[PDB]
Structures are given as C-alpha cells and as structure tokens.
Design a protein around this ligand. Structure first.
Ligand code: POV
Ligand code: POV
Ligand code: POV
Ligand code: POV
Ligand code: POV
Ligand code: 6ZP
Ligand code: 2J9
Ligand code: 2J9
Ligand code: 2J9
Ligand code: 2J9
Ligand code: NAG
Ligand code: NA
Ligand code: NA
Ligand code: NA
Lengths: 420, 420, 420, 420
C-alpha cells in the first residue's frame, strides 16, 4: 500500500522541479523536505504518494465553528497518513494531531540590512584618535603655551636686545608674549613651524619636548588612519532585540496574524512588552502581511523584520545585503505530522533520531540552505577618499574663516577706538 | 498511586536545599527539574515522590551482556515511572524507553577562556623602534651636534659678519655655540626647525646628512606603527570550530568516553575529522575525565574544552573569565523519560507544550541559569587610540615641563650671581 | 607478421606531416607516439604498420548492451595489436585489455588566463583622494588666500613698522600682497614654510585653521595610500583548487561527459564536492563540449577550465596569455594498450623502462611540448615603486619648470617696459 | 593459505606500532603501506603474514657475483609472495621480478631551508622605491637647482636690495648662488626647509612644483614602507634546479650511491651535467651518506639536498624550516613487488586501479603524510625595527661626517691660500 503524504510548497522544503520532459508524476517536487521523505521510506517500509493540500494553508481554527484549515484537517480526517512539511509543533495542533519528534529547530529572529560603510559621516577623519585624545591635545596646547609664557618671563636669557643696529641701544624686548606663545604651540602642533624659536635653555626644553609630543601624535594619527582605511571593520546599530527595543529610528515588523506576531502578544517579558507596545500602536506601518513583502521593506527602508529563524538562514544566503541581528527569541520545531493515534508517530520518531546520528539531517540542510556563495568579504580593494569620507575639514575651514572676519571686524573697531 | 520519579543529581538541575532542620522527605530537593516536576504535577494532577537513582548514571549498554544501567534501567524495569532529569533524547535510548517531547535544546559548543586584554604600559609609544635604536638616535644627536660645534668653529666660512646694518666692522661671530649646535640637532630631528641654518659647505654636509637620517627614522616610526595597528586590527579571536581546526597552540578537549567525543568518532565532516584526529592521535593530555576537570584546564592552560551547551551557559555565566566561542555543533534535547508504551508520554508532551506557549520554560531557565550579576559589562570596543594606548606621551610631556621650571630657577640664580 | 597499431589523431601525439608528395604509407604520420613507436620498434625488433582507428574514440561501454568502442574495441577483438596513443590507464579498461607500464603521467589541473598587469597611467599618484577632493583643495587655496589678502589689508595690527633699524618713521607696510597671500596658502599646504607669518590675531586664525586643514589632507593622503599599497600586496591570484572553491566571480569548466567531470561525480573530498555542486546545479554555461571550446572560453571570459595536465602544458606553452594554476588534482597515466593476455605487455614494459633510464622519454616530450620560444621572460617581481607606478610626478615636475621659464621671460619683458 | 608479505621499515610506510600491551603478533606494524595491504586483502582474497627482510635492503646486484640483496632476493627465491614496500619500479629490477602498476608516483626534488627574513640587510630601508626612482630623485635635485640658478639670474624681481638700513644704498645682491640653489633643492627634499625662499613668480613656480614633487615622493616612501612592514613577502634565492645549477654559494647534495645520485651520473641534459660536474669534483663535501644525515646538513648549513619527492613531502610537514624548491626532476613509481611470473601481478594491478577510482590512495596518503599542522604563516605580529632592518643610515651618516671633515680641511686650506 502507498501512503498519502500531504505537503505544502515553500522553498527550500518543497519546490517544483522546473526541469524539461513533461508528463511528470510524483517527480514534480524536490527540496529538503522531499529528500527527508525518501530517507524515511528507505529506513522505514512504505511508498509515498505526494498529494498537496488543496487549501494552501498549514492549519488553524476559524474561532467560530472550530474547523481546521489545511494539512491538519487532512490529518484529522485521515485523508493523509503523514504531513511531512514545515509544520511547527505547537500546543493547539498537538491536542488534535500527533507530531513526531523534531527534525529541525528554529525560533524568532531578526532580519536587518548588513552594515555598508558608504556613508561614514561628513566627519570621521577624526576617528583614529579617541575624543579624549583630541581634547587632551587641545588642553596641552593651552598648557604648554602658558608654561612658555610664564617661563620666558623669568628667564633672563630670553630677554634679548632688539635693534642690533645701535650696539648700545639699551632696550630689552621679549618676543614671547601671550599671543605669540599660543602661536608657537599651535604652530609646532600643525607641523608648520612659526617664526618664533626659543633662545634660552629653559624655553628650548619646553619647545623641544612639545616637538617630540607632536611627532608621536601625528605619527599615531597617520598610522591608525592607515589601519582604519586598510581593514574596514563596520558594525550595526542594533546587535540584539533589546538593543532594538530602544531604537525608534529602526522600526520593527512581523507577518500580520502569524506565529511570530502571536508570540509578542502573549509575551510577559519586559522587552517583548515594549516591542508589542510599538507594533500594536503603529499598526499598518510596521506590521507587513507577507514574509516576502517584509523582506522588501527591510531592503527599501530602515526596518528590522521579525520572522522565523530557518527563513533568515535561507534568505540571507541568497541576498548579501541581508543579515541576522540576534540569536533566537522563541524556540519551536518542525515535526512530521501524523494522524491522531497512528502507528507511524513512533516509527518516524526513531527514524529521525537515526538520520541525526548518522549526520544526514545536517548534510541535507547544508545542501538546500547553503545555496549561492554570498561572497564573504575580503580585505577589499580600497577606493579613493572622498567628500563622504574626509568631508568635514571643509566645514571647519569655512567655520574658521567666518571666525576670522568676526575678529577682523573686532580688530578694526578696537584700534580705531583707542586711536581716538 | 503516587508516581515514583527517577532523578540524577546535577546542577542547575536536581540539588539539595541547604538547611539545618532534618525533617526531610520530598522537600529536600530543588532545581530546574524540580520546578518542572512541580509544574507538570499542577496541570496534570498527579502526586509524586522523588527517588534519586542509586546507580548514579544516566543510561547505556554495559556491553558485557547488553544490560542497561542508571535511569533508563529503572524505567525499563518499571521500577519508577518518570525520569525528570537531563536525559538526552538519543537513538539507543528511544528504542528501550519512550521520551516526552523536549523541554530544553542543547548542542556541542566550545569553552574558551575569555580573551584577556593587553596591558600596554606607560611607554607604549616607544615600541615601533627597538630599544637599541632609541639609544643610538640619542647618541647620534650628541654625536652630530658635537661635530657641528667643532666644524663650525673651525670652518672659516661660518665666521661671517653678523652686523650688516650696524656699520661694517671686524666683529665676526658664529651662530653655532654648544647650546645652539644641540638645538640644530634636536630641532632638525623633530621635523620642526631651529632658528639656525648652516652657511658653510662643511656644515651643510653635516646638516644635509642629519636631515636624511631624520626622514628615515620618522618614516620608519610611522610605517612600523601602521604595521602594528593594522596587524592588531586584522587579528580576531576564534569564533568557530573551523578556527580551532587551523590553530595549533590552542589544544582541544572532551570528556573521555562521553557523548561529546562519540559525536566526533561517527562524524564525517572534514572539519570535524581534523578535530577528532587531533585527539585521536593525542590522548592522556587532552581527553580529560570530567566536566569539572575540563573547566580547570581552560582556566589555567590554553585548553578549549568541548562540553554540552547547557553546561557552558551555566559555567560561563558564573565564572566570567570564561566564554563560549562559536555556535552549536550537534543538536540534542532533554526529554522526560517514561517507560516503553506508557499513558504519560502523551499527557506530558501536551503538558510541556503548554508551558512553552505560556513562557514558563523560559522563566524557569532564566531563574537557574542567570545566577550572579557577574559584571558582564566589558565594553569591548576599541581601535581608537586612547589614554591606555598613547598616554605616556602626556607623562613625558608633563615631566618635560617640570624639568624646565627647575632650569628656569637655575637661569634666574645664575644671572643674579653674575649681576651681584 | 608485422604488428598493426591502433592509433587516434591528437596533438602533440599522432598527426599528419604536411607536404605535397602523395606517395604515403606508414610515413605520413608524426608526433610523440610515432617517435615512441619508432623507438619501441628499434630495441624490440618488430616492424609495424600504423592504422588510425576508424571509430575515432578512445574506449568506453556504450551502455546499450555493454559493447566497447574506439581503440579498446579494436584491441579486444584482436584486430590490431598495439594502441600507442593517449589511452589512459583506468580501472574499466584494465579488465578488458592489458596496458603497458606508463610512458607519461598526467592529472587534472586548471587552465586560467594569465593575470594581466594593471596599467596605472601617468597621473596615478593622484588616486588616494577622489577627484572632487583635489578640486576642493585647490579652491580652498584660492579661497583662504583671498581671505588673507582681505583681512590682512583690513586688520590694523598687520600694519606694522617695517623698518625698526632704518630710523623710526610712519612708513607702515604689510607683507601680505596678493602674490604673497597665495604663497602662504601654497607654502603652508606643502608642509614647507613661506617666508611670511601672520602677526595679527585675525590673520592667525586664518593661518591656524589652514594649518589644521593641511594636516588632515596630508595624513589622509599618506594613510589611504598605505591602505592601497597594503591591500595590493595582500591580494594574490588563485593557485589552488581550494581557491576556486571560495571565489564566485570566476566560473569553472569541464568537458561534458568526460574523464574530468567523472572524477568530480565520484569524489568525496568536500573541497571537490563544492566544485562539483557549482557545476551540478549550473550547466549549459560552464560544462563546455570540447577542449578547443574550453580554451576559447578562458581566452575571452573569466572561465577556469579543468582539463588533463598534458594538454595544458601544450596549450600554456603555445598561447602565453594562459597559465596553469595549482598542481595536479587526479593522477593518471598513459599506457601502450595491448590485448588481454599478450606477450607484448611485458616486452614493452621493460622497453618503456629502458627509455626512461636513458632519458629518452624526457627528450621526446621536450621536443613536442616546448614548441615556440613564446617569450616566457615576464619579470613578475614588484612592490618597489617604479617609473610605471609613480612616474607622473616627474611629468608634473617637468611641466612646472617649462611653465616657469615662460614666466621668467614674462618678468624680463615687464621690467624692461617699465625701464624704457 | 596465508601469503608471505616481505616488507622494510621506513616512515610513514611501515613503522613499529609503539603502543603498550606486548606479545604482539603481526600487529606490530602500521602506516600507509600497511593500510594499503589490508585494502588489498579486502578487495582480493588472501591473508598476509608480514615477514620483514632479514637484510634491511631493498635490492640490487653486487656487480661481482650477480646476486640480489634484500626483498628482490626474497622475491626471486619465492620466499615471499608480495613485496608491498617503497620498492621503486626500475629497469634492472623488472627484468628479474614483476611489479604491479604504481600506487604512488615520485621523482627527484630539492630540499632547502624556507626563507626567513631575519637578516634583510643592513640597508633595505631603501627597498620601497626602486633604484631607478632613488636615482631619478637624485638627478631631479641637480636638475631643479640648476634651473633655479639659471632662472633666478634673468628674473629681475629676484635681484632685490640688501642693506634696507640705508634706503638708497644702491647695491643689488641675489642670494640664489649656485651653492644656495642646491641647498634649496636638498633642503626642500628632506622636509626641513632652508633659509632661502623665492621672491619672484618665476622662481616661486620652480620652488612650488619641487615642493609638490617632494610630498608625493615622501608620502610614497612612507606608504610603501608601511606595505612592506605589514605584509612580509619573502623569497628564496633558488626556485628551480637550473637556478641552483648556477649558485656556487649554495652547495648541492645526494645520498652516496643512491637512486638519486645515479640519475645525475647517467644524465645527458645540460643542466644535470653541470650539477654532476659539481658533486663529482666536490665529493666528500656535498655527497652525504644518509638521507637523515642530509636533512641535518640542510639545517646546519647553506645546502640544497637532492632526494626523493615523497620524503620531501613527509619531511617538510614535520619541520617548518624546510621546503621544496622545485617540481620533479626524475619520474619513478612505487610498485607492489610480485615474484617472476606470478598470478598476483594482474590482481594487485586491477586492485590498485580500483582503490584509485574510489579515492582511497589519496585519503591514505593525506592521513600519513599530512602529519603535524606546520602552522602556515599569517600576517604575523610585527616586531620592533632594529639594526638588522634600518641599520645602514648609521653608515651613510658616518660616511657623511667623514666627507665633511675632508671638506672642512679643504675650506681651511683654500681660504688661507687666497688670504696670503
Ligand atoms: C574669494 C572669497 C571666497 C571665500 C569662500 C571660500 C573660502 C573657504 C572655502 C571653503 C569650501 C570651498 C570648497 C568647495 C565647496 C565645498 C563643498 C563641500 O565639500 O560640502 C561639504 C560641506 O562643506 C561646506 O562648504 C559647508 C559650508 C559651511 C557652512 C557652515 C558655516 C557657515 C559659513 C558659510 C560661508 C563660509 C565661507 C565664506 C568665508 C568668507 C559637505 O558636502 P555634503 O553635502 O555633505 O556631501 C554629501 C556627503 N555624503 C555623500 C555622505 C552624503
Ligand atoms: C592631526 C593631529 C594633530 C592636530 C590636533 C588639533 C586639535 C583639535 C582637533 C580636533 C578637536 C575635535 C574634538 C571632537 C572629537 C569628536 C567629536 C565629534 O565627532 O562631534 C562633532 C565634531 O567635532 C568638531 O567638528 C570639532 C572641529 C575640530 C576643529 C578644531 C580646529 C583646530 C585648529 C587649531 C587648534 C589648535 C589649538 C587651538 C587653541 C588655540 C560633530 O561630528 P559628528 O556629528 O559626530 O559626525 C558624525 C560622524 N561620526 C559619527 C563618525 C563621528
Ligand atoms: C610644570 C608642571 C607640569 C604639570 C602641568 C603641566 C601643564 C600642562 C601640560 C600637560 C597637561 C595637559 C594634558 C592634560 C592632562 C595630562 C595627563 C593626562 O592626560 O591624564 C590622563 C592619562 O595620563 C596619565 O596616565 C596620568 C598619570 C599621572 C602620573 C604623572 C607622573 C609623572 C609626573 C612627572 C613628575 C616630574 C618628573 C621630573 C623629572 C624626573 C588620565 O587618563 P586616565 O583615565 O587616568 O588613564 C589611566 C590609564 N590606564 C587606563 C591604563 C589605567
Ligand atoms: C625619503 C624619500 C626622499 C629622499 C630621497 C634622497 C635621495 C637619495 C637617497 C638615496 C639614493 C640611494 C641609491 C641606491 C639605490 C639602491 C642601491 C643599493 O641598494 O646598493 C647599496 C646602497 O647604496 C647606498 O648606500 C647609497 C646611500 C644613499 C645616501 C644618500 C645621502 C643623501 C644626502 C642628501 C641627498 C640629496 C641630493 C644630493 C645632491 C646634492 C648597497 O646596499 P646593499 O649592499 O645592496 O644592501 C643589502 C640589502 N639589500 C640587498 C636588501 C638591498
Ligand atoms: C625647463 C625644461 C624642462 C625639462 C628639463 C628640466 C630639468 C630637470 C627636471 C626634470 C628632469 C629630471 C628627472 C629625470 C628625467 C625626467 C623624466 C623621466 O624620469 O623619464 C622616465 C619616466 O618619465 C616619463 O614617463 C618620460 C615621458 C616624457 C614625456 C614628457 C611630456 C610632457 C612634457 C611637458 C612639456 C611642457 C608643458 C607646458 C605646459 C602645458 C622615463 O622612464 P621610462 O622607462 O620611459 O618609463 C616608461 C613608462 N611606462 C613603463 C609605463 C611605459
Ligand atoms: N597602540 C599603539 C601605539 C601608539 C603610538 C605609538 C606606539 C604604539 C604601539 C606600537 C607597537 C608596535 C610593536 C611592534 C611593531 C610596531 N608597533 C606596540 N604597542 C603596544 C601595544 C600594547 C602593548 C604593548 C605595546 C604600541 O602601543
Ligand atoms: O515544541 S517542542 O517539540 N517542545 C517545546 N520546545 C522547547 C523547550 C524549548 C522545543 C524546542 C525545540 C524543538 F525542535 C521542539 C520543541
Ligand atoms: O532528539 S530530537 O527530538 N530529534 C532530533 N533533533 C534534531 C534535528 C536536529 C532534535 C533537536 C532538538 C531537540 F530538542 C530534540 C531533537
Ligand atoms: O594507472 S596507474 O598505473 N595506477 C594508479 N596510479 C596512481 C596514483 C597512484 C598511476 C599514477 C601515474 C601513472 F602514470 C599511472 C598510474
Ligand atoms: O617506472 S614507470 O612504471 N614507467 C616509467 N615512468 C615514466 C614515463 C615517466 C613512470 C612514471 C610514474 C610512475 F608511477 C611509474 C613509472
Ligand atoms: C577572573 O580572574 C581571577 C584570577 O585571574 C579569578 O580567580 C576570578 O574568578 C575572576 N575575577 C573576577 C571575577 O573578579
Ligand atoms: Na513507542
Ligand atoms: Na597599512
Ligand atoms: Na618481468
């Protein structure tokens, strides 16, 4: 006798073999879920007649008359003898049919776009030194220039003789004022030397140690920028569901009235209360109505989509824009369906545990999920550095020339006032 | 009739409550599988009496005569009914007892000691050149500058008329004193400039060859620093079982004759066959006897112990010097064991599936597997240069300013004694 | 009796000598396996008569009724004795005919088009910054320097007494003309110095912010150039069959239903199973019909054709745009076929082993497989920067000196017209 | 009946199993060559009694009485029925015994030490620019300084007025002499600016384009040195037997009176005449008497050792100092020995071809040759740069200070002569 195996089509479980040579009979189908069934028939004894569900659904109640819709209706009415399909073991189904012990484990997880690094900021020339170091080198310019100003006063060898023309023109002038001491410090830091050079041994040590400080700072900026521009190490804003529970910029998602959205409704964990407070209020914006439509909204928006973990492992290897941003939120499993009180539950159970010990469930999953190579990134050929990369030095230049005109007005007003 | 529950002692599973009052029966036990047996008894009705297995094992064939031991022997002889315990659902146990449908999912994953952060030190800036080079650059500054002082005193073309505006006389003068010849050497070394410049050809070949020495020193400081900061950014800790296959200095582990190494015997994946052949040829060093001895090996040595994933998440959570590298290798599950053909296989399968939908099997795991706070903060983000990496250049700067005040006092006293 | 030799037409194997005189018999053929059949006839005595196989194949089961074809059919039917030809010693042929012991060793290896050298161009130095940045740095030089000319003319503190030695007067003068303000901008940009330096605070904020702009431009030129020169030095062409397994943009090949792809069907190595599954799923694009069509695919496209190693060493030697990446994958051998249980299996095995000890099987291969000179020089050593990499900076230097002579003429004429 | 398999011990072919539990009988041995024999007995029908050669030799004649010495004496006298061992198929042996068709292919190849990079030269700071570029930047200093000297003469705005003190002191002095024009060029190249700055537009273009030339040269030196010090790509002096046929520094080698040395004696190829002209003349220096002794002389000298290719694949994976420096010079094969005219030649032949089609000869060789990991090098953690790396700038400094004293003597003699 041949068994009636009911079955639905999702990729890579059960998919139409699109080969030539028509008049196909029971060889129309391929996939992981068809390779499982031929491994069962080898290890059990049966022949299988693959007979698709004539409703296109997995199975649920209608909540008005209480009648099952799909494979679990073909399993309660004995129209099928197996249900080898992505049929998730849950509580309302197993009070009606009998499942075997799982051949595949999953959970809820997150789709999001892989980080890209094409807009690093109009700044981010400023990353090779930490903002502590960009601030401590600002204070060291203020520190050394005050120490230069103070030391050059009570250093009698800095008090030199200007006007060398008259040999005894007794006038004593120090060129280390307060303004000229910052211009040594700002001058020495930016590698273009100033017109002032210290002439006493007390001020040549301050100038000499600020020069060695400056070499180590610029050589650490140029070397760590050569590290950043060689090894591009880019990261995502969110790295979990709790890091995503705070982000109001990235908006969440679910299939409308699915197994994934129902989990957040019945949840009592504090993080998944906040994630359902979001999607219930912002309904028709984040709650998509298909998992294929939800992949497009990750792709054409800033959108983190909550769906099953076995689809994300499939989709993110057919599309290298896409990645998985967590672990597993729920925990469910795919079970081979079996009608209620049937001798086939315990035989598929010991079969699935037999194919697992051999390594056959892993080799079948790596054949149907690991599809396209998705060319995992290398130390990529570097591209020319542009306005998207350095960028913001044209801002601090234009903000530095505006500050100059406000001082050039100020120097004109101040001199003309004290002239009169 | 009250059910008799077979049970092993493990942690966070069935334990003993530590208290003084010795009036104990059915109440001396706590743990995960006592909270599970409490909540399976509530929603199904039965009253239980916990009896630890006297044999102390889980279950296996003795291979002498094919007799079972441990918990699956007490179930197959119908001595005690349930087996609420970490009794993993495997193929050889399923043919002799009937498990429930899983309450926990584990796998094989890898302990490893959490990567300890590098202590740079204060003078970490000084590293891209060897300590023989930093001495020989400092001796060449005292060398070249004393060669300038000898040559520019001896050369006739460096004796020039210092006063072209102050009317013409015979008052010829060098700019190269001993304190000024050092300042050409220290000034030219730091890529800034001194106020001096050589005028004779004998002093320009000194300056012109000290300028080429200076470029090769500073272009090799910056390029060897960009070498380290790139290599430090390329390197990554192991995050897979493939990464353990490549490495040689990190040694593996397992429990000798356990469920973990039995997976690597029957394995056919070439990445796992290399992992078995590491510990097939080698033994008595990395095939340690217990889980507790395997933790101590990772904790001292460079061991990479492979146990089940539910024991790692208890160990890694408590001792926060430890981590879990990679994902899961196997995929197994814990089931409530019940004897062969029993009416409580199906009443507990539905009872376990009810506690998953309500979320109780998550909150029972978070109660026993989170334990201490154990400050998991560890802000492991880096590669911007901070005060730990380049912080000693502020200490060399600060010591150079304290030294200069001590010379500033010295110049004030040496001038006043010349004055009075 | 004279022996009748079965023989196929291939190159550098049995060919036709191209000449006009049509008096041909046993003398119209040349090639490797005619020089071998000449030298096996010398040291063993026999006289031969070469007869091309009419079927035109080598040999295989037709699978219709288990009948052989080609050369191993003419041997098994005892029609012609020897089979001096590229008749590879395989398992299915050894059960029906008796080979000699090999005269040539081949394997499976990979054609690939020889990696074509990058043409840098003249202005290749100009690449670590994008062409929008090189324009915006040049506009900021014309921008900042015109802001200096406006401010230092307007600011009262830049008007200073230019003559402190020339006795004191009211002859105040700026150093910032229009030609001098450009020279602060061009001078400070190139990390050298102008002879000028700002004296007023309104012009020091211009100079002090153009000095910070200059550092970030030059530290990003040097660090993005160290990014490219490191990445260019990391990258390597494929040199294995493992390196083809990783890559996606390079597509594979084989002869459809041939000895090469039959190896990848029966293979169990995971690196070769990934190479079969590339061309198991994909077909009608990379499973080309012949060796000659497979060479043209590598020669135009990004094809990586896998044929036998003795045909590559003939193809790679003649068309020097082609190479052999990696070593050998299989290991096979060519034997002189002889019918089942013959007295010439052993007399030729010793005769082939004599020609190896004397060295004749090497000199016969070097005669037919070296062919053209085909200038294999190709000095493929690099990574020192030469005139092809940085050579346009000498052309920008040479154009800057020709431009200056044209301005030197212009200054001589503009002064003489002012003179006269 | 049990077969008598004669056998010799070399690793990894036949090696004593050093396990515990004595009273071993016919389980003393392991290796590739024992794993082959159990694969033959599975695929043929026999049982095998491993009975070692009682002479310790493979087999040859004595050239006085003509009696075989070893396994091929036990094969001619029917004391053994197989000779499964590293017994190379050659012409003088197969006229006496019968070999099967080969289970392993080899040839003569070269041992040499892997390149190390611990003595790159006391120079080799000088590698990031090619010696064309170090010379063309020397000529550009001479070129621009002559163009600066020529242009500054007929540029009337360079002829400025010194002595600004007297406003009408009509004297016209140009500070761009011939010596001061090289000091601009050498000054601008070494990034320490000179005291001369051009004042006419004709000389500011020459100075301005020599500054942009200088930035691109120093930024290309620092960036290509950061490429070299990050990716260490080190190469061997020899890369063939013809590149080694010229090198008299590296001296050659062979086992004395072996299969490898006899090939160079009987050779007629022009390269292997020159390599035997060497070893025959320089006997007792290059011709070692054991292959284990010859590996030590590669290791404790500069010595290229010529030995069999299957040992080099074994030895260079147990010792990461060692590497293979060519292809294959000879071509031989290992054959299962068989007595003269025996029914076992044709059965081992079809067996070896059967284990090859399955992939068993490759999986057995990868198990016994791929031993220790030999930790294939990464982008290694860079080490501090030392006297072994930069080094020779202390030579050009000390050679530049000696040239200064010879000019400082010269300037003293020249001035004192024209003074008198
Ligand atoms: C003769 C007198 C001339 C004087 C002016 C010239 C002298 C100085 C010249 C300076 C710049 C000239 C260079 C070319 C133009 C730069 C364009 C650019 O780079 O855009 C950058 C901003 O850079 C800006 O220009 C922002 C303007 C400053 C606004 C803030 C201060 C207001 C001052 C106002 C007036 C100040 C100036 C007036 C001071 C007197 C950013 O571009 P983006 O859009 O983010 O690109 C997309 C990035 N993405 C790909 C990641 C998405
Ligand atoms: C070459 C080394 C030697 C030079 C050292 C020079 C020291 C000072 C240098 C830099 C100091 C900057 C400290 C800020 C650190 C980060 C803060 C930040 O990112 O936010 C803001 C940037 O902040 C600015 O835009 C500040 C502009 C700096 C110009 C300073 C003028 C120096 C002139 C002379 C000074 C001499 C002394 C003056 C006293 C007389 C906004 O950026 P964002 O919105 O976050 O951009 C998004 C992209 N991102 C997320 C990737 C980041
Ligand atoms: C003339 C008076 C001079 C003083 C004022 C000068 C005026 C202005 C000049 C410079 C000041 C302007 C810059 C800002 C502050 C500089 C310091 C700084 O940045 O601290 C930061 C780092 O640096 C440190 O590590 C601090 C440690 C202080 C110890 C000093 C002992 C040597 C003093 C020499 C004695 C004389 C020797 C005489 C000869 C023998 C603090 O950061 P952090 O978070 O604590 O980092 C901890 C590091 N860790 C993470 C690895 C643990
Ligand atoms: C920072 C960039 C800008 C600076 C550019 C500076 C321009 C000129 C700079 C360098 C020119 C060098 C040309 C030689 C090139 C290779 C030859 C060689 O290696 O052999 C020899 C080296 O040769 C020397 O030792 C030459 C020393 C040059 C010192 C020049 C002093 C500059 C002073 C002022 C000059 C200004 C103009 C003067 C005109 C008035 C011997 O070495 P080796 O035995 O082979 O070492 C073994 C290791 N190895 C095998 C790995 C190699
Ligand atoms: C005032 C008079 C100036 C001249 C003397 C100045 C004195 C001193 C100044 C400079 C001289 C000192 C340096 C040494 C020689 C410099 C060149 C050189 O190195 O050649 C080398 C490289 O460079 C080349 O590619 C040469 C090509 C010449 C074409 C010039 C056209 C532009 C001229 C603009 C006309 C005016 C424009 C006006 C405005 C529009 C030759 O090497 P190669 O082996 O041939 O390399 C081939 C490259 N390839 C391998 C990829 C194929
Ligand atoms: N990081 C960093 C750093 C920053 C400025 C100057 C030097 C360094 C540095 C350089 C090196 C190094 C070493 C070899 C070759 C090249 N570079 C090492 N270290 C460092 C970092 C941590 C601990 C000890 C040393 C360093 O801190
Ligand atoms: O629906 S189940 O058969 N029973 C409940 N659970 C979990 C306890 C997590 C799991 C976990 C993983 C599965 F594959 C199946 C199930
Ligand atoms: O022992 S099972 O009931 N059947 C086998 N498997 C797996 C398919 C992975 C799993 C995986 C997780 C489980 F919890 C149980 C099982
Ligand atoms: O067809 S064979 O005589 N036997 C099988 N092999 C082997 C690689 C072992 C080889 C290898 C190279 C040959 F030339 C012949 C043969
Ligand atoms: O000694 S053989 O059996 N006959 C001669 N040769 C070669 C022609 C190269 C080879 C080449 C590889 C072998 F494995 C055996 C032999
Ligand atoms: C981690 O380190 C110490 C010893 O290195 C260990 O004893 C302890 O468990 C950990 N220290 C903590 C958690 O502070
Ligand atoms: Na059962
Ligand atoms: Na780099
Ligand atoms: Na023979």
């Amino acid at each position: 006798r041949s068994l009636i195996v009911t079955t639905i089509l999702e990729e890579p479980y059960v998919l139409f073999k699109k080969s030539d040579k028509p008049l196909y009979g029971n060889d129309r189908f391929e996939g992981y879920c068809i390779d499982l069934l031929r491994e069962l028939s080898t290890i059990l004894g049966f022949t299988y007649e693959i007979r698709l569900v004539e409703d296109g659904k997995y199975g649920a109640q209608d909540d008005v008359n209480g009648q099952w819709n799909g494979m679990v209706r073909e399993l309660i009415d004995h129209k099928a003898d197996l249900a080898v399909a992505p049929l998730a073991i849950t509580y309302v189904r197993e009070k009606v049919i009998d499942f075997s012990k799982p051949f595949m484990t999953l959970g809820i997880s997150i789709l999001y776009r892989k980080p890209n690094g094409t807009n690093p900021g109009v700044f981010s020339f400023l990353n090779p030194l930490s903002p502590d170091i960009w601030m401590y080198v600002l204070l060291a310019c203020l520190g050394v220039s005050c120490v230069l100003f103070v030391i050059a006063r009570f250093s009698p060898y800095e008090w030199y003789n200007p006007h060398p023309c008259n040999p005894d023109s007794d006038v004593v002038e120090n060129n280390f004022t307060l303004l000229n001491s910052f211009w040594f410090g700002v001058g020495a830091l930016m590698q273009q030397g100033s017109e002032l050079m210290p002439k006493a041994l007390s001020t040549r040590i301050v100038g000499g140690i600020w020069w060695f400080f400056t070499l180590i700072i610029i050589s650490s900026y140029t070397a760590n920028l050569a590290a950043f521009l060689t090894v591009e190490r880019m990261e995502s804003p969110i790295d979990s569901a709790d890091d995503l529970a705070k982000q109001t910029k990235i908006e969440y998602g679910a299939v409308e009235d699915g197994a994934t959205m129902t989990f957040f409704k019945k949840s009592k964990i504090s993080t998944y209360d906040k994630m359902w407070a979001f999607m219930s209020s912002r309904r028709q914006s984040v709650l998509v109505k298909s998992n294929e439509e939800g992949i497009q909204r990750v792709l054409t928006s800033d959108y983190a989509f909550l769906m099953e973990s076995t689809t994300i492992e499939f989709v993110t290897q057919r599309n290298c824009n896409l990645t998985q941003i967590g672990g597993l939120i729920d925990s469910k499993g795919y079970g081979v369906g079996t009608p209620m009180g049937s001798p086939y539950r315990d035989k598929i159970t010991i079969a699935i545990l037999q194919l697992q010990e051999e390594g056959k469930l892993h080799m079948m999953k790596e054949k149907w999920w690991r599809g396209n190579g998705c060319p995992e990134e290398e130390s990529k050929e570097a591209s020319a550095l542009g306005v998207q990369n350095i960028g913001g030095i044209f801002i601090v230049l234009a903000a530095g020339l505006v500050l100059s005109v406000f001082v050039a007005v100020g120097e004109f007003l101040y001199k003309s006032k004290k002239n009169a």
